[PDB]
Every structure is written in C-alpha cells, then in structure tokens.
Amino acid sequence: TNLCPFGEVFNATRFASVYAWNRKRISNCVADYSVLYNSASFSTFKCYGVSPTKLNDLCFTNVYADSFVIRGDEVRQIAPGQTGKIADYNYKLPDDFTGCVIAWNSNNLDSKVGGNYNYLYRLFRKSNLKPFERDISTEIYQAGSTPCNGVEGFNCYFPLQSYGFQPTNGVGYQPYRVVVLSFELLHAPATVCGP
C-alpha cells in the first residue's frame, strides 16, 4: 500500500525544455487523483478520453508522466489536433490521445530579471513530428539550395532558439509548467489501480 510519487513530477525543482521534455514511469502504486483534481491550484486541467470527475476506480498497465515548460499562449497547443511551432516541431500528441494535461503558471519561479534563457524550442524542421517523437539533433537548417557546409551564413540557421522569460511580461509571455499523464493498458499486469 504505497501511494504514487507525484511530488517528483509536480513538485520538481527543475523542469525540461519542450524539445527535450522529460518522461517518468509510475507503477505498482496506490495513486490518488482526488488530491490533484481537488487542489484548486492548477489553471488548466483537461482530460481527453477519461472523465476526471471521480473515476479513480480504474486500473491501467502503466503511467507515463511527460513534463516540460512553455509560454502561456502556447498552452492551447498541447492538445490533439493543434498546429504551430510547438505542435509541429517540439511536442506532438496523437489524435486519439487518452490522458490528462495539467498546466499551471510558473512566473514566480521560471521568470528572471533580465530574462531567463534556459528553455529552448525548435523553430525550423524539414518535416513535422510524429506523436511522442523527440528530436535532439543540432544540424543546421538550410533555407536555400546551396549546401551550408556546417556554417550559419546565408539561408543557414540554428534550428533551436531560446525563450525569453521576464516577470513583467503579459500572461501570454509568462512561463507555464505542463504535465501530461498518459495511460497504457496491456494484457497482463494492470498494476496501476490506485484506490
């Protein structure tokens, strides 16, 4: 009778960039979801497929917790069937996604005077990302027809660019911490029930 560790994904001292989002495995636990749903501390709490309203009486094979940080105006992009730089090049969700997305403001921690530039996102790519894909390549992007030869000159760009987070920005330019809980059900253990 051991409860799930959610203070390791939610109450985490450091979050990851959107292009290199972090993933955690949670299994063999007594996970309680009423604490999260009834905490009155999260701005966005949306569940697709499953109903959050007192469905803590279900069992799943495995739980994936994917966490990262984005800007506010892009929080609506973390959803099935969304377009934009984040959805196409950084983080993609399947059309038939079942699971929950929790987002909360992180201005008091992730915004710094003069700008906090520790979070990065991909601006260019040859094609869009697949669901749950993760690209960490640093090859320079060629917007022209002449080979770039590994140098960022004319039509040669660094595909990764850093956010600028400041405490005085508007809500669309303020940092937001995002956690996605994805549930997998296989034909054996069903080890994640959480009464």
């Epitope: 993933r23 399947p94 749950f132 894909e133 993760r134 997998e184 034909h187």
Partner: antibody, heavy 126, light 108 residues
Framework: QVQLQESGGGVVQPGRSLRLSCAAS????????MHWVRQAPGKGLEWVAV????????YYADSVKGRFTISRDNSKNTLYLQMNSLRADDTAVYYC???????????????????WGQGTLVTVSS | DIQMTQSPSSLSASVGDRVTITCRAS??????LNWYQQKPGKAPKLLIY???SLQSGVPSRFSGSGSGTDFTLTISSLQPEDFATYYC?????????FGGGIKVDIKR
Amino acid sequence: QVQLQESGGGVVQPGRSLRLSCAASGFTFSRYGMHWVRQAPGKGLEWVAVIWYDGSNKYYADSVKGRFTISRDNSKNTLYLQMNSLRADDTAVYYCAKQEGTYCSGGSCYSGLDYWGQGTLVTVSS
Amino acid sequence: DIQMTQSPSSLSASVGDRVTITCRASQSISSYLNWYQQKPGKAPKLLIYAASSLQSGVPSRFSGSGSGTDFTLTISSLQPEDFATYYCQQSYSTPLTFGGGIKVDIKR
C-alpha cells in the same frame, strides 16, 4: 497474455527467396513500431530491420540492404519480411520484436524491445 | 554506424555476490540504451530500458545506470536463476547495433 508468433522458417537453396511472418495478440498493433532480429548458430544477436507504427519509414541493416524488404499489415495484425538473393551466411534464428511505448515512444520512433517471439530457424544450404 | 563494445566476454561469480557488467559505445547516444538477458535456447526478454528503467516483473535487485558513452548494469544479489548471457543495445539511430555479449558462470 501478450503473445507474438513467427512462421516461415525452413531450408532453402542459395540464390532463392523466402518470406517470414509474425502475428501479434494482446495489444493495439497500429500504435507500435516493429523490429526483426537474428542470431547465428553459436554467435550473438544482430539487428535486421525496423518499421514504424504507420509504415512511413523503413530501415534495414547494411548486410541485407538491397535484398531484404520489410512491411506491415496492421489491418490483419501481422508483420512481413521478404528475403531475396539468399547466401549461406543468412542461416540464423529470426525473432519478431515489439518495442516499448506507443508511437515514437520518447525518441525518433526507436526504443527498447520488451516483447519477443520464439523465433524460427532459417538455413541456406544445398 | 555506432559500434557497441562489450568486454570481458566471460565472467565467473558465486551465489550471494555482486555482479557488474559494462557496455561501451562509439558516439553519443544520450540515454537510449537497453539491457537483455538470455538463457540457452530461449528468447532474450528485456531487463532495463532507457538505461535506468526497470521492466515490470523484474525483481527489485537489477539496477542500471549511465549516460553518454559508457554504461553499467548491477545485480547486487546473485541467485541460482541469474546465470545467463547479457546483451546491450542502442536505440539512437539506424542501424541499431547489439553488443558482443558476456556470459556468467558458476565458480568452484
């Protein structure tokens, strides 16, 4: 009760062709990428080919490039390998493997192999 | 390609001791490493994926760690059923490559 089962192994004369199938049960086939592995008698493990969840991209090893073709039919829950221009160095046990995680499973649609078949023996001789 | 080197190819240990195995790489593969067991005449089956994550059903004594180009695997309690051949695989880019493998035997 997740299960994978291979079929098609046997003897074949050099220069001919062969076809191998693996069928799956216990999970949603269309969400996962699949791999082929082989093990020579007395030798170690060697990776052969990979196909993605939706079948867009296909990749093979250099020792079999231009001869082996991988495909998937996930409306019938099956994965296929076609072997052409067989030499005597292709004698091995073949395993069909399912990777852990859905879709790209956290990176470039490649991840660890958590469910394996029992394998089939293919020997090329005369 | 990325060559995955596994050495030594043999090892001897006695029941109750701690066993450590090392796998080497040739380029940067981040944390895309996996460990497999194999007993004679049997399918491999997975022990640790993502270089630090246990698989469901594995006894809570196998532990794996490592990032970059060098990795390790630990047992910490050798049981009579822990005598097999161990393989390491990378899943960063194609062609995905296996290691040579190491065999653990009984000491007398």
